[PDB]
């Protein structure tokens, strides 16, 4: 009875799993992430004793 269950009509219950494993480690971001400063001004000004 192959024909009487055509593939167009056999919707098999997939397993609720997405293989969403991509590189997400961002320790460079990780460190210096909780110390992000949200300015209300666009520029970042500071002094540097060059000599």
């Amino acid at each position: 009875l192959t024909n009487l269950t055509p593939t167009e009509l056999l919707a098999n219950k997939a397993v609720d799993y997405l293989a969403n494993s991509f590189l997400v480690e961002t320790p460079m971001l990780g460190l210096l992430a909780n110390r992000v400063i949200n300015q209300k001004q666009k520029a970042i000004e500071w002094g540097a004793k060059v000599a």
Partner: protein, 52 residues
Amino acid sequence: ISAVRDPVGTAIADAFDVLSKKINSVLYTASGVADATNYGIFGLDAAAGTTV
């Protein structure tokens, strides 16, 4: 910045830092002559000497 609101204070701190650092430098190799490189200090290479 707070380090510019007192250019006198900042220059004092800078001079103190560089002065401590020069003092440390001279206290090592200072032949004892006073010529702005060694400051009459005798250090260790004029106190003890340089070589055998």
